[PDB]
Amino acid sequence: ANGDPAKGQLYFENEGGCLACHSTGTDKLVGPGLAGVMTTAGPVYPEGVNYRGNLPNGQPRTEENIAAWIRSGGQGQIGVMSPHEMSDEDMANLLAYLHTLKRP
Ligand code: HEC
């Protein structure tokens, strides 16, 4: 919505620390690559991991549930997320930058 992908990228690289665990493409550092994470197809998971088209916590793939997962974190078959509480404008910018990540 009212998100800034430049501020979103700055939060992704510094104030959020997401790049140190997540790749902007389809590679896997600690978690899955967030390429296409904001689309209905989801990101690229390693072979064997499957959440049945939903988030690792069980909720479907929507902006609200993805934001709630990011703020809450959790553990799935791959690794462990950390809780990243953030303001609403920062979350909007972060979701915008995640939208900028396209999965081929
Ligand atoms: C290392 C501690 C990480 C940090 C820093 C960030 N993420 Fe994370 N993320 C990590 C793991 C190990 C996983 C997979 C969990 C599992 O085992 O199932 C994830 C997952 C996500 C997801 C969901 C992916 C999906 O397929 O639905 C999202 C949307 C996500 N991560 C986003 C995200 C953001 C916005 C971060 C900065 C606040 C961030 N991650 C940091 C590990 C780590």
DSSP string for 28-89: -SSS-B-TTTTSTT--BPPTT---SSB-TTS-BS-HHHHHHHHHH--B-SS-B-------HH
Residue 70, exposed/middle/buried by CB under 10 A (0-12, 13-18, 19+)?
A: buried
Helix (H, G, I), strand (E, B) or coil at 21: coil
Give me the torsion for CA of 81, 83, 87, 88, rounded to 10°.
Answer: 50
- Residue 96 Cα distances to 67, 73, 78, angstroms: 12, 19, 25
Mutate to test the pocket of ligand 1, among 11, 18, 52 (most ligand atoms within 8 A of CB): 18
Domain boundaries, the chain: 5-100
For the CA of 12, the nearest atom of ligand 1: 37
Nominal resolution in Å? 3.1
Q: Which fold has domain 5-100?
A: Cytochrome Bc1 Complex; Chain D, domain 2 (1.10.760)
Q: Rounded to whole angstroms, how far apart are CA atoms 65 and 73?
A: 11
Q: Rounded to whole angstroms, how far apart are CA atoms 63 and 4?
A: 16
Q: How was this structure determined?
A: X-ray
